[PDB]
Amino acid sequence: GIKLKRLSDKPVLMPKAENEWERAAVFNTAAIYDNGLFHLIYRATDIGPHAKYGKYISRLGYAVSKDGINFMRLDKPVMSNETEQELRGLEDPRIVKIDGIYYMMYTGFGDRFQDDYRICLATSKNLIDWERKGVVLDEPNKDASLFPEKINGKYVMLHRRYPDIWIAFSDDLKNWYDHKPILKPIPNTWESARVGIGGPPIKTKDGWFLIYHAADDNNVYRLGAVLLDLEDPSKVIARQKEPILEPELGWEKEGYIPNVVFSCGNAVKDDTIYVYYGGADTVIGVAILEMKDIKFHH
Numbered sequence: 001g002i003k004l005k006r007l008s009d010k011p012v013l014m015p016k017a018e019n020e021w022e023r024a025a026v027f028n029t030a031a032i033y034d035n036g037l038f039h040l041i042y043r044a045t046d047i048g049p050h051a052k053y054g055k056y057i058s059r060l061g062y063a064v065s066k067d068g069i070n071f072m073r074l075d076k077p078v079m080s081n082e083t084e085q086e087l088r089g090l091e092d093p094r095i096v097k098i099d100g101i102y103y104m105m106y107t108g109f110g111d112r113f114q115d116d117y118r119i120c121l122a123t124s125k126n127l128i129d130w131e132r133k134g135v136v137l138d139e140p141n142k143d144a145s146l147f148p149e150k151i152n153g154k155y156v157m158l159h160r161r162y163p164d165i166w167i168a169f170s171d172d173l174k175n176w177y178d179h180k181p182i183l184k185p186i187p188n189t190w191e192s193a194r195v196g197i198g199g200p201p202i203k204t205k206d207g208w209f210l211i212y213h214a215a216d217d218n219n220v221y222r223l224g225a226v227l228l229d230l231e232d233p234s235k236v237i238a239r240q241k242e243p244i245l246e247p248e249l250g251w252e253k254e255g256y257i258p259n260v261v262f263s264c265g266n267a268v269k270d271d272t273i274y275v276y277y278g279g280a281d282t283v284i285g286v287a288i289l290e291m292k293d294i295k296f297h298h
C-alpha cells in the first residue's frame with residue numbers, strides 16, 4: 001500500500017559539535033512549506049536524549065531549504081529553556097499555519113515530579129520570534145497538534161493520553177471539550193505498545209491524512225497512516241495495517257535511541273508530502289509521498 005520513499009541515504013540535518021545546544025542530537029522536527037521555502041523547527045540536545053547519557057536539555061533550532069534536502073541552519077535556538085515547565089527543555093514540536101499565524105505545540109519537560117511533561121503552545125508570524133501561550137492541557141500528555149484549519153468554527157487538536165491518540169475541540173484554545181480516543185495500539189503487531197501522531201494532519205478530498213507513529217514490544221518505532229473523516233475527524237475511514245516507514249538505514253537503526261523513525265513534521269509542495277523524521281533520536285532524514293499515492297485498501 002502506502003510507503004514513504006527516502007530522498008537521500010544520508011541525513012538532511014545532523015548535530016553540530018561547535019554548538020553546545022545541538023552538540024549531541026537533532027531530531028523530531030516540525031516542518032512547513034511557506035513562501036517558497038521548507039522550514040524546520042528542530043529539537044536539539046546538548047547530551048544524548050536519554051537519562052543514561054545525562055540531564056539532556058532540548059531546545060528548538062531553525063533550518064531552511066529551497067529543495068527540501070539541503071538545509072541552512074541558524075547558529076542559536078529560536079526557543080530555549082525559559083520556564084519551570086521547560087526546565088529540561090522543549091520537545092517534538094508540531095506546527096500549523098492558520099490565517100497568517102503559526103501555532104506550535106511542543107512538550108515542555110520539567111521533570112520536577114512524576115509525569116512532569118505538558119503540551120505547551122507558542123505562536124509566531126515569522127517562525128523566529130515565538131510567543132509562549134502556556135500549557136494547553138494541564139495533564140501528563142504529549143504528541144499534540146492543532147488541525148491546520150478550524151472545523152465547523154472550532155479549533156481541533158490531537159493529543160495522546162497514554163497509550164492512545166485522542167482528539168479535543170475548543171472555541172478559543174483556552175478550554176477544551178469533547179475529549180475522545182480515536183486510535184489505539186493493536187496487540188501482537190508492530191503497533192502494540194503505544195501510538196501517537198506524527199506531524200499535523202493534511203487535508204485531502206477523501207479525508208484528513210494523518211501519519212502516526214507506534215512502538216512494538218521491543219520499543220522499535222515505526223510510522224503508519226490513517227484517514228479521518230473531514231467533518232468528524234473522530235471517525236476513522238481507513239487505517240493501513242502495514243507501516244509506511246521503518247528503521248532500515250544505519251543512522252535510523254543506530255544512535256542514542258536504537259531503531260527509531262519518528263516524525264513531527266510533514267511539509268507539502270506541489271502535491272508532494274515531505275515527511276521529516278528523526279533517526280535514532282540523533283539525526284533528521286526526509287522521505288516523500290505524492291498525494292496521488294494516498295490509497296487505502298479499505
Ligand SMILES: OC[C@H]1O[C@@H](O[C@@H]2[C@H](O[C@@H]3[C@H](O[C@@H]4[C@H](O[C@@H]5[C@H](O[C@H]6[C@@H](O)[C@H](O)[C@@H](CO)O[C@H]6O)O[C@H](CO)[C@@H](O)[C@@H]5O)O[C@H](CO)[C@@H](O)[C@@H]4O)O[C@H](CO)[C@@H](O)[C@@H]3O)O[C@H](CO)[C@@H](O)[C@@H]2O)[C@@H](O)[C@@H](O)[C@@H]1O
Pocket residue numbers: 049051091107109111114115116117142162194
Ligand atoms: O517527554 C519526556 C521524555 O519522554 C520520553 O519518553 C516517554 C517515557 O519516558 C520515561 C518516563 O515514562 C514513564 C514510564 O517509564 C517507565 C518506568 O516507569 C516507572 C514509573 O515512573 C511508573 O510510574 C511505574 C508504572 O506505574 O513503572 C516504573 O517502572 O520508568 C523507567 C525509568 O524512568 C522507564 O524506562 C520506563 O519506560 O513509562 C510510561 C509508559 O510505559 C510513561 O507513561 C511514564 O511517563 O517518563 C520520564 C519523565 O516523566 C522519562 O524520564 C522516562 O525516560 O518513555 C515512554 C516509553 O517507555 C514514552 O512513551 C514516553 O513518551 C522521551 O520521549 C524523551 O525524549 C523525553 O525527554
